[PDB]
Amino acid sequence: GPKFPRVKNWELGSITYDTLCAQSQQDGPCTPRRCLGSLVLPRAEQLLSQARDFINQYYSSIKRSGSQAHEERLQEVEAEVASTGTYHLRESELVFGAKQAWRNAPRCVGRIQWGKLQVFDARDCSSAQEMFTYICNHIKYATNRGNLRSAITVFPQRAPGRGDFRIWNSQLVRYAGYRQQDGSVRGDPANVEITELCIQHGWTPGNGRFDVLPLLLQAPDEAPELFVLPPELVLEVPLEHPTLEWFAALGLRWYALPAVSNMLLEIGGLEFSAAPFSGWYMSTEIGTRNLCDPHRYNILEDVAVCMDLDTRTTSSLWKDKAAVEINLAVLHSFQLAKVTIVDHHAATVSFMKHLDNEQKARGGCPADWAWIVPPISGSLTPVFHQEMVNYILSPAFRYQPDPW
C-alpha cells in the first residue's frame, strides 16, 4: 500500500492513511525499540527555518503561496532576524498561529471548535498590574455569564537576555490545598505547592475545601506580584443530583472556566511564555478526575457510603456506580445553572467528526489515544475503537519548567 501510517477504526472497519505526519519537524520520545507514549512528560538558522515554515503555512492558509506578498514577508522576516536576532508577528499571523496551535494539540478532544477562538493581543503589556487587567478581561469575556467562549490572551514574547512574562498559577482559577498537621490535605491536593508559594509571597489564606487562589503574575526581571480575583468574576456551580437529594448537602462545587495558564505557545520559533487559554469543561474532567482521583478530592468512598453501597469488596462495582452519579451530578448542575458543559459521549462523537474533516483538509490528525479516550466508559465512546497517530506539529502548545 501507501508508504504512510495506515489507520483503522475497528468499529466501522474503515481505513485511512495519515500523510500529515510527514510535516513534523520535532521528534517525540518513541523509537523502533520501545514505545514511550504513555509518558505524561518526557525530557539563528534554527530560528530562520522555523520562521520560514510558519510564514509558508500562513500564506497557504490564505491561498497566496508563491505570491510577492509571501516572498516579501519572507524577505522581511529574515532581514529582521539578521539585524536583531529576533522578529515579530503581524497581527493576523498571531491569530492564525494561535488557532493552529490548538488545532495541532494531540491531547485535546474539543478541537472541532478550533476555528472559533477569540484572540486577544496583549503584546503591548508592560506590567504585572496590566497583566492582571488583561487577565480579568479574558475571564469576563470567556465566562460571558455562563455562555462560555474560547479565548487566549497573548502576552509579550521571550526576548534574549530579558526575563520572561510568566503566570505562576497552572490555571487562572484553582482551589487552594492546605497541608495539615495530620498530614492530610484540606482542599485540592494538586495545589499544595502553589498555595504555599502564595502564602510566602503574602496571601492571607482561608480554610475551606474550595478557596479560590490569588494569581502570582511575573513581569520581566521582577519578583512576581500577587492579585486576588474579584469574586463576582469567578463563576461557580454548586453541585446537586437530579434524584439523590442528599448529594447537595455534601457542599461540593466547581468553577466554570477551565483556563490553562502555564503553557508555552510557540509560533514560527517565537516563544510566548505567557498566553492563558480557556474553553469549556468536559464533564469527566470534574466528575471523574478532580472529584474521584485518589490523589485529589477522592470523594468516591463518601458518596458510595451515602449511596448505601458495599464498600468492602471490589466486585460490588461500588466505585463504578458512585463515579457514574458524581458524573451525572456534574452534568445536571451545570445544565441547571445554565453554564456550558459537554458530556464525554457528545464530546467524543464530535472529535470523530473532527477526524474526518481533518482527513479531508490535511490528511491526518495528531492524536494521543490515552488522553483522547475518557477516564470513565472508554469503550462506550467511539474514539476507543479509532487508531491514532501521535506526532508533534508546530505551532504548538508546549509544557515549560515552573518559574521558581
Ligand X SMILES: C[C@H](O)[C@H](O)[C@H]1CNc2nc(N)[nH]c(=O)c2N1
Minimum CB separation of residue 141 from ligand HEM in Å reads 13
Partner whose footprint covers residue 36, from ligand X, its own copies, ligand HEM, none (CB < 5 to 8 Å by kind): its own copies
Peptide bond into 32 cis (omega under 30): no
130 is known as an active-site residue: no
Do the annotations mark residue 38 as ligand-binding?
yes
158 is known as an active-site residue: no
Minimum CB separation of residue 72 from ligand JI4 in Å reads 36
Residues that bind Zn ion (CB under 5 A): 30, 35, 37
Applying CB under 6 A, does 343 fall inside the site for ligand HEM? no
| Cβ–Cβ under 8 Å, residues 205 and 230 | no
CB-nearer residue toward its own copies: 138 or 344: 344
| Cβ–Cβ under 8 Å, residues 116 and 110 | no
Applying CB under 6 A, does 141 fall inside the site for ligand HEM? no
Give the separation between CA 263 and CA 192, rounded to whole angstroms. Answer: 19
| Cβ–Cβ under 8 Å, residues 332 and 325 | no
Partner whose footprint covers residue 152, from its own copies, ligand JI4, ligand HEM, none (CB < 5 to 8 Å by kind): ligand HEM
In angstroms, what CA-CA distances link 38 with 34, 42, 219, 371? Answer: 11, 10, 35, 9
Applying CB under 6 A, does 105 fall inside the site for ligand HEM? yes
Contacts 24+ apart (CB under 8 A), 327-331: 327/283, 327/284, 327/287, 327/288, 327/376, 328/241, 328/242, 329/239, 329/240, 329/241, 329/242, 329/244, 329/247, 329/252, 329/287, 330/239, 330/254, 330/283, 330/286, 330/287, 330/291, 331/283, 331/287
Coil, strand, or helix at residue 101?
Answer: helix
Q: What are phi and psi of 31, to 5 degrees?
A: -155, 165
* CA dihedral (276, 280, 284, 288) positive or negative: positive
Partner whose footprint covers residue 113, from ligand HEM, ligand JI4, ligand X, none (CB < 5 to 8 Å by kind): ligand HEM
Which residues lie below 8 Å from residue 304, measured CB to CB, with a gap of 6+? 311, 318, 319, 321, 322
Over its C-alpha atoms, the chain yields an Rg (Å, rounded) of: 23
306 is known as an active-site residue: no
Q: Which of residues 255-294 bind its own copies (CB under 8 A)?
A: 288-289, 292-294
Q: How many CA atoms lie within 13 A of 298 on its CB side?
A: 10
CB-nearer residue toward ligand JI4: 88 or 107: 107
Applying CB under 8 A, does 387 fall inside the site for its own copies? yes
162 is known as an active-site residue: no
Applying CB under 6 A, does 277 fall inside the site for ligand HEM? yes
Query: What are the residue ranges of helices labelled H in 144-247?
Result: 192-200
Binding mask 359-378 for its own copies (x = CB under 8 A): -------x-xxx--xxxxxx
Instruction: Tell me which of 225, 266, 285, 325 is the catalytic residue.
Output: 285
Instruction: Tell me which of 103, 111, 166, 174 is the catalytic residue.
Output: 111
Q: Select from 107, 140, 145, 353 the one that contacts ligand HEM (CB under 6 A).
A: 107
Contact range with ligand HEM by CB under 6 A, out of 4-12, 21-29, 109-117, 329-337 = 109-117
Q: Which of residues 313-342 bind ligand X (CB under 6 A)?
A: none
Applying CB under 8 A, does 327 fall inside the site for its own copies? yes
Instruction: Tell me which of 21, 103, 108, 114 is the catalytic residue.
Output: 108
Contact range with ligand X by CB under 6 A, out of 155-163, 353-361, 380-388, 395-403 = 380-388
Residues forming the active site: 108, 111, 280, 285
Residues forming contacts to ligand HEM in the complex (CB under 6 A) are: 102, 105, 107-110, 113, 117, 150, 152, 277, 279-280, 282, 285, 342, 347, 371, 397
